[PDB]
Design brief:
Name: Pericentriolar material 1 protein,Gamma-aminobutyric acid receptor-associated protein
CATH topology: Ubiquitin-like (UB roll)
Assembly: monomeric
Keywords: ATG8, LIR, signaling protein
Entry title: Structure of PCM1 LIR motif bound to GABARAP
Order of helices and strands: HHEEHEHE
Strand content: 15-25%
Strand order of the largest sheet: 2-1-4-3
PDB class: signaling protein
Oligomer: monomer
CATH architecture: Roll
């Protein structure tokens, strides 16, 4: 076979969240409902590493963030927890799309939260999962 075999790129929708494998729907839905009632100005977020990414692991998965925090500021928060420089690449994906840095986390949540009331974000060193 004379071909360049393309086997190292992540195909759409292949992401799987450990958080959802380990905690069943009714228990996530329960907690997400409660936290959204108790803190209406904040959103609950799950962050895990995208398929095939080459990048440092994240220590913590679950974040409770102000609705008015921007995506650009959440990139800063995550960079710091993984000990990346500002010059090191980092991309987020929500429902397989790269969100704009100008959006707020509250806008992302309203448009994209799942039915357990959490917003799910994947991260990588490259953009390709979202293209």
């Amino acid at each position: 076979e004379d071909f360049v075999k393309v086997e190292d790129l992540p195909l759409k929708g292949s992401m799987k969240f450990v958080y959802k494998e380990e905690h069943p729907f009714e228990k996530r839905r329960s907690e997400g409902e409660k936290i959204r009632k108790k803190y209406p100005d904040r959103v609950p977020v799950i962050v895990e590493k995208a398929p095939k990414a080459r990048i440092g692991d994240l220590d913590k998965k679950k974040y409770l963030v102000p609705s008015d925090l921007t995506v650009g500021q959440f990139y800063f928060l995550i960079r710091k927890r993984i000990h990346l420089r500002a010059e090191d690449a980092l991309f987020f994906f929500v429902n397989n799309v790269i969100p704009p840095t100008s959006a707020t986390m509250g806008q992302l949540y309203q448009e994209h939260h799942e039915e357990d009331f959490f917003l799910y974000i994947a991260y990588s060193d490259e953009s390709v999962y979202g293209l």
